[PDB]
Design a protein around this ligand. Structure first.
Ligand code: SF4
Ligand code: SF4
Ligand code: F3S
Ligand SMILES: [Cl-]
Ligand SMILES: [Mg+2]
Lengths: 559, 268
């Protein structure tokens, strides 16, 4: 029966794809998350000020983003306003996380779908240098450098211990780059590992460590005192400035031009891999202290049916709007397993056996009932896509000038129409473009931090509602964020100082989640069902290209 | 065989421990992978998916029997918990753990979840999560805890084992002494402030700005063993208390269930 790919590798976490084939064509696809922890259940009864530290450990690839959504949920419930410096620092850390996370997704998770490492061994080092230099000003392009990189990979492959390259799909006809482009991408893969571990120092300065920096409800834990040996001062701020500059340079000169050069060989991937047409953003990144959606860099809204002329409004609290369904998930709802729950009323009761979970060792899911540890989030009953493509569409639709210029100049370089955005290629391209937008914004928030400190405001923490005895005995709130994979919300309900409910709905929950009661597929499933053919079911590179373009994270999706 | 074989198992993890490993500045993951080890299976990085990926783990186990190192990230639902809580390729994590460690030279449990149960095991433990040392008894196990551990502690332990041809000396909980032998509080730069009775009372009052002690805000440094206060994080950039937050205790067993993070304990 179904073709099975389990594990999907080069994602975060535990994902199984099953596909019902009609000849070489994917007829139906099924997305299944095969690990659960039940962090929502772990939180019940605990202190809301501690929640961020638990839910940050939902996921260490998008580290930071659940910490941020969590303290924002508490701040929303309690109506705490942040001081400006805290808000700027949070924006800066969020931008640093996007850039780190997108660059590594592209090189270390996605690129081996498009780049043939064995073919790189055939490249002429000199031609590889000409090509690198015809696309970018990046310094590291000499022929000797390419020849030295190629030789290290050649010694590796010839040792007969191929490590993470063993049994790879090298030489598959889906690989189209010339040897030179493959060698260039492999060299950049290696530069991206050195660059990323340097970039991570940015979160360590403000947050103490990366992965998993620290947060506090009401501000940031790192104080500012120019005259102190143990606070952010001119010396620490000078290091932060240099890190933003290396982020800018790597995005402008390595990541974006490589994405564009590689796209030119895969333009037909602009015609598959988007089967929903609906996109959702909560928006993020305010210019000022208050979390006011009117000031967001990424706007809040929803697009339906690929119509960029109408942005529908999003309400995080309307109980008929965002709901999670479990008609095909391994959960039990006390209201009935066919009902959708808004997250203030969410329930996380794990039920593998009674929902049709198959006893290991198994070869096939049973897809007639529960077939995933992911809930199925829907927006007013619709399956939607979240993440970079949703954001770039929202920016485009709302007249963001730089986004419009980048999208137009990208489509024009590739000679593609606007409807090629709705595709595996367009999603992968959107990820790179929004990295450019964020990296340019970093300088504005940094300068605004320095100016604010210079004018005499060194406050970083609003203490006024820190003590539980100052809270109402009932409160509830939602913390929203645009995480690198898309719209993220934490809904919290607080009773008598304690967490009474806490529900996360996470970007990969939306995208990777399974079918609902109407048989309506989620984003991954509808994407694979949109115009895919497999040359060889044992080397399903076509599935991987599209699944990886969503940047799946199943620890996030399931929690 | 000729670079020693390493099999990386990822179970109920958040992938923080693998990210941490990619942060390490010396030896870097790429130098390790090219020059020092043969990393033969690792979900985050593997070119191949599905059966081609599983075949690589099995062929590593076949060709390096008795000699390979297993690193485990994440807790494992124990053999009394539903085998369906966490599976890979249709097998339970527990089944994969026991079959892969059977012929390992040694096992490193990286991260507090693998070492001690960690987050999936925090109350009320809905998945019956357990640690490596509880499940795997007839094998040398080295615990390298932290959430996640420091990047250069992870590669430090690996480099020790490869360069010096032996396991590090361990404390009573299986933790390498070089990294876990001293408490945070016995090395912390705010400690002489603690002893003078100088304490921060919020995250940005005078004491916070001056680097007075964080004890009153919940710091668990006094009962936490890790290298953060001496080695620091991310190539010596900073660490949690230096950046203004109390230590959460994140390398200690059951640290999630130690009362609130922002509450002092009842004494020392
Ligand atoms: S110890 Fe922390 S960082 Fe490592 S797998 Fe467990 S949760 Fe993630
Ligand atoms: S309580 Fe924490 S901040 Fe204070 S000296 Fe000890 S480890 Fe340092
Ligand atoms: S929270 Fe963890 S990272 Fe270090 S400072 Fe405390 S042991
Ligand atoms: Cl480090
Ligand atoms: Mg949830």
């Amino acid at each position: 029966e179904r073709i099975v790919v389990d594990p999907i590798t080069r994602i975060e976490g535990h994902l199984r794809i099953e596909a019902q084939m009609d000849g070489a064509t994917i007829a139906q696809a099924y997305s299944s998350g095969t690990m659960v922890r039940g962090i929502e259940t772990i939180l019940k009864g605990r202190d809301p000020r501690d929640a961020w530290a638990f839910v940050q450990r939902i996921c260490g690839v998008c580290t930071l983003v659940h910490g941020i959504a969590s303290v924002r949920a508490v701040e929303d419930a309690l109506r705490i306003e942040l001081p400006l410096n805290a808000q700027l620092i949070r924006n800066l850390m969020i931008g640093a996380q996007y850039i780190h996370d997108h660059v590594m997704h592209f090189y270390h998770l996605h690129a081996l779908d498009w780049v043939d490492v064995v073919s790189a061994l055939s490249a002429d080092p000199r031609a590889t240098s000409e090509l690198a230099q015809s696309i970018s000003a990046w310094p590291k392009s000499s022929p000797g450098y390419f020849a030295d990189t190629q030789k290290r990979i050649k010694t590796f492959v010839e040792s007969g211990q191929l490590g993470i390259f063993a049994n790879g799909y090298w030489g598959h006809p889906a690989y189209r780059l010339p040897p030179e482009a493959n060698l260039m991408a492999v060299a950049h893969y290696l530069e991206a590992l050195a660059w990323q571990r340097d970039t991570a120092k940015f979160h360590a300065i403000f947050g103490g460590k990366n992965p998993h920096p620290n947060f506090v409800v009401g501000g940031v834990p790192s104080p500012i005192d120019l005259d102190s040996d143990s606070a952010l001062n001119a010396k620490r701020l000078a290091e932060v400035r240099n890190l933003i500059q290396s982020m800018r340079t790597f995005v402008d000169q390595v990541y974006v031009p490589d994405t564009l050069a590689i796209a030119g060989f895969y333009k037909d991937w602009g015609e598959r891999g988007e089967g929903l047409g609906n996109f959702l953003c909560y928006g993020d990144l305010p210019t000022g202290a208050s979390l006011d959606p009117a000031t967001f860099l990424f706007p809040r809204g929803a697009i339906l049916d690929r119509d960029l002329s109408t942005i529908h409004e999003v309400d995080l609290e309307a109980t008929g709007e965002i709901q999670e369904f479990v008609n095909h998930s391994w959960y039990e709802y006390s209201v009935g397993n066919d009902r959708g729950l808004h997250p203030y009323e969410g329930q996380t009761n794990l039920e593998y056996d009674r929902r049709g979970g198959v006893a290991p060792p198994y070869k096939q899911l049973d897809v007639s009932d529960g077939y995933s540890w992911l809930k199925a989030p829907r927006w007013k009953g619709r399956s939607v896509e979240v993440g970079p493509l949703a954001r770039v569409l929202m920016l485009y639709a709302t007249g963001h000038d730089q986004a419009r210029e980048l999208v137009d100049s990208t489509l024009s370089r590739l000679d593609l129409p606007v409807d090629a955005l709705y595709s595996t290629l367009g999603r992968t391209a959107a990820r790179a473009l929004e990295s450019k937008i964020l990296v340019d914004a970093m300088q504005g928030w940094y300068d605004g931090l320095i100016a604010n400190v210079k004018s005499g405001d060194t406050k970083t923490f609003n203490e006024t509602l820190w003590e539980p005895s100052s809270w109402p005995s009932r409160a509830q709130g939602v913390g929203i964020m645009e995480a690198p994979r898309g719209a993220l919300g934490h809904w919290i309900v607080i009773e008598d100082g304690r967490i009474a409910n806490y529900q996360a709905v996470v970007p990969s929950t939306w995208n990777a989640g399974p079918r609902d009661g109407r048989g309506q597929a989620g984003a991954y499933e509808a994407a694979l069902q949109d115009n895919h053919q497999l040359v060889d079911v044992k080397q399903p590179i076509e599935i991987l290209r599209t699944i990886h373009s969503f940047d799946p994270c199943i620890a996030c999706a399931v929690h | 065989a000729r670079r020693p074989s390493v099999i990386w198992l990822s179970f109920q993890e958040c992938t923080g421990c693998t990210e941490s490993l990619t942060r390490a500045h010396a030896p870097t993951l790429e130098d390790l992978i090219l020059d020092f080890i043969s990393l033969d299976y690792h979900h985050t990085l593997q070119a191949a998916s599905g059966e081609a990926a599983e075949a690589a783990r099995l062929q590593a186990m076949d060709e390096n029997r008795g000699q390979y190192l297993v690193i485990v990230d994440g807790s494992i639902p124990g053999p009394d918990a539903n085998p369906g809580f966490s599976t890979v390729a249709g097998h339970s994590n527990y089944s994969i753990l026991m079959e892969t460690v059977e012929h390992a030279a040694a096992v490193i449990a990286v991260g507090t979840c693998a070492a001690f149960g960690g987050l999936p095991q925090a109350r009320p433990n809905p998945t019956g999560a357990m640690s490596v040392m509880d499940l795997v008894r007839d094998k040398p196990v080295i615990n390298v805890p932290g959430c996640p551990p420091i990047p250069m502690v992870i590669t430090g332990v690996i480099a020790h084992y490869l360069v010096f041809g032996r396991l590090p000396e361990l404390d009573g909980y299986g933790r390498p002494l070089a990294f876990y032998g001293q408490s945070i509080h016995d090395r912390c730069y705010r400690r002489p402030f603690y002893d003078k009775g100088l304490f921060a009372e919020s995250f940005d009052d005078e004491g916070a700005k001056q680097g007075w002690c964080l004890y009153r805000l919940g710091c668990k440094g006094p009962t936490t063993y890790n290298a953060c206060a001496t080695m620091k994080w991310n190539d010596g950039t900073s660490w949690p208390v230096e950046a203004g937050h109390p230590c959460l205790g994140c390398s200690e067993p059951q640290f999630w269930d130690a009362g609130g993070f922002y509450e002092p304990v009842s004494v020392p």
